[PDB]
Amino acid sequence: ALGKLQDVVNQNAQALNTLVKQLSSNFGAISSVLNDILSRLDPPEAEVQI
Amino acid sequence: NGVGYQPYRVVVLSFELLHAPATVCGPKKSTNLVKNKCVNFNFNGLTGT
Amino acid sequence: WNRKRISNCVADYSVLYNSASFSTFKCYGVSPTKLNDLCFTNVYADSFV
Structure with a gap:
């Protein structure tokens, strides 16, 4: 109904769940x-990953 | 002979940083267990608050 | 090359890298300055000349 x-x-709610789940992705780092x-x-070498 | 042909001794410390019970923990000493309050905890080298 | 397991102990890499005897000492993926306070599951030492 x-x-x-x-x-x-x-x-x-799914959009928020995807926003939270992106935090577990390394993005190449x-x-x-x-x-x-x-x-x-x-x-010095941390800043490039960050 | 020239250093270009000389022998270099080599050892490779392959630090396998894994999520498992760790064995070689480094010099830093422990601190008494704290509970129910905000603390910059550090267990096995994972820095946390 | 021989592989010697290093485990069940405590280490001090500060003397190892500080000593002038090591004309070559290169770390990959970790920086030596903070090796003292982080623990590791297993360390492999492979010796070859």
């Missing part, structure tokens, strides 16, 4: 976690 309202809720990239490289 309430498909339009449910569809709005689903679209907004050593690792997704910024703290480990800082804690396993010196500042």
Whole structure:
């Protein structure tokens, strides 16, 4: 019965879930976690990954 | 002979940084376990707050 | 080349890289300045000349 309202809720919630899931992607760098990239490289070579 | 032909001794420390119980932990010493409060924790080399 | 497992111990890479005896010392993917405070699951040492 309430498909339009449910569809709005689903679209907004999926968009947030994808926004959160992008945080696990390295994007070409050593690792997704910024703290480990800082804690396993010196500042000069960390800045390029960051 | 010239250094270009001289022998160099070589050792490769291949640091396998893996998610597993770690063995070689470095010199830094521990600190007493803290709980229920905000602390810059550091377990096995993972820096966290 | 022989492979010697390094595990079940504590290490100090500061003396290893500080010593002037090593005319060549190159680290890849980790910077030596902070090797002291990060732990590792296993370290492999391969010796060859």
